[PDB]
UniProtKB/Swiss-Prot annotation:
Alphabetically ordered keywords of this record: Aspartyl protease, Disulfide bond, Hydrolase, Protease, Signal, Zymogen
Single GO term (MF): aspartic-type endopeptidase activity
Domain of life, per lineage: Eukaryota
Record: active site: D35, S199
Source organism: Cryphonectria parasitica (Chestnut blight fungus)
Segments forming domain Peptidase A1: 17-328
Protein name: Endothiapepsin
Catalytic activity reported: Hydrolysis of proteins with specificity similar to that of pepsin A, prefers hydrophobic residues at P1 and P1', but does not cleave 14-Ala-|-Leu-15 in the B chain of insulin or Z-Glu-Tyr. Clots milk
Stated family: Belongs to the peptidase A1 family.
Residues included from the entire protein: 90 to 419 of 419
One of the GO BP terms on file: proteolysis
The EC number(s) this enzyme carries: 3.4.23.22
């Protein structure tokens, strides 16, 4: 089997991407944030504290003939940005782009933090990291990809995120029309539960390539590119007037600037992030100070190749027995 679903930015900044997901019988369609940096499929639901719902579409398990309470199971998750959610668990039929999993753990939120409430466009998350990070207790549950794997033509999914445009998540096949040149594959460590890999270096604009190992995770659920302070300083030093602002929470730059591109290495291959991808616009409405799309990972504890980097590439998440990551230009 295969599946193919369109993923759409939630706003004009590409802050996140939503993908329609069919849950239950008859189908309830929720728009979920596909997140290769976590491993829980959780949704706004009929059980979510009413004051914490503001515009989201909810999953109502009582209206699904195939929903079953997973008795005794609870979940609770906290994300790198400080947000969180928790609740109980149902199993139900879940379909993505024509690909169906029966018995999928659907984590029903009783509580969500303000950040989720305030985002009316995201109805939940669908985790695509390794199932070892799944937070369901006392019986850990498998991701959608993990459950689908054996049925897939090939044990892969791909992320093709757009710049200010829709893109595609595919399951079970590689669309050879979706990228240019060849795909370069690189080793993955699953030791922390992430799609963790080592970039071979970087360049800033038309500058020379610096060969240096940068361990990081491929994370569709993170907006920006978070890299070591040395790398990020080297980038923003090429933008007149750019500075790190503790009041704003990172690097800002004059909105009048033209940003340089940023290149990262995948083996001997190179992925170029155009300068425009690194512009996240005014820090506040009407401001002439703009927020940078490359920020320091110092104090995160890990480097994150988030959407800013991934949307510059066609990315293969290979879930074979020995997992790997593939990157192609597009």
């Amino acid at each position: 089997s295969t599946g193919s679903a369109t993923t759409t930015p939630i706003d004009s900044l590409d802050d996140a991407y939503i993908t329609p997901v069919q849950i239950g019988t008859p189908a309830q369609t929720l728009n979920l944030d596909f997140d290769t940096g976590s491993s829980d499929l959780w949704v706004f639901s009929s059980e979510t504290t009413a004051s914490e719902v503001d515009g989201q579409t909810i999953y109502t398990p009582s209206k699904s003939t195939t929903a079953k309470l997973l008795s005794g199971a609870t979940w609770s998750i906290s994300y790198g940005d400080g947000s969180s959610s928790s609740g109980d668990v149902y199993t139900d039929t879940v379909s993505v782009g024509g690909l169906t999993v029966t018995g999928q753990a659907v984590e029903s939120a009783k509580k969500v933090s303000s950040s989720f409430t305030e985002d009316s466009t995201i109805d939940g998350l669908l985790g695509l990291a390794f199932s070892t990070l799944n937070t369901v207790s006392p019986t850990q549950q498998k991701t959608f990809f993990d459950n689908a794997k054996a049925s897939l033509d090939s044990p892969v999914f791909t992320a093709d995120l757009g710049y200010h445009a829709p893109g595609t998540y595919n399951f079970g096949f590689i669309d050879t029309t979706a990228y240019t040149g060849s795909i370069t594959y690189t080793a993955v460590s699953t030791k922390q539960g992430f799609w963790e890999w080592t970039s071979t270096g970087y360049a800033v604009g038309s500058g020379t390539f610096k060969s240096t190992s940068i361990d990081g995770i491929a994370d569709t659920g993170t907006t920006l590119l978070y890299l070591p302070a040395t790398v990020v300083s080297a980038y923003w030093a090429q933008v007149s007037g750019a500075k790190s602002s503790s009041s704003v929470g990172g690097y800002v730059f004059p909105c009048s600037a033209t940003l340089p591109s940023f290149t990262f290495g995948v083996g001997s291959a190179r992925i170029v992030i155009p300068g425009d991808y690194i512009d996240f616009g005014p820090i506040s409405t009407g401001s002439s100070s703009c927020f940078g799309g490359i920020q320091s990972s110092a104090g995160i504890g890990i480097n994150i190749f988030g959407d800013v980097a991934l949307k510059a590439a066609f990315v293969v998440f290979n879930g074979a027995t020995t997992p790997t990551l593939g990157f192609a230009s597009k």
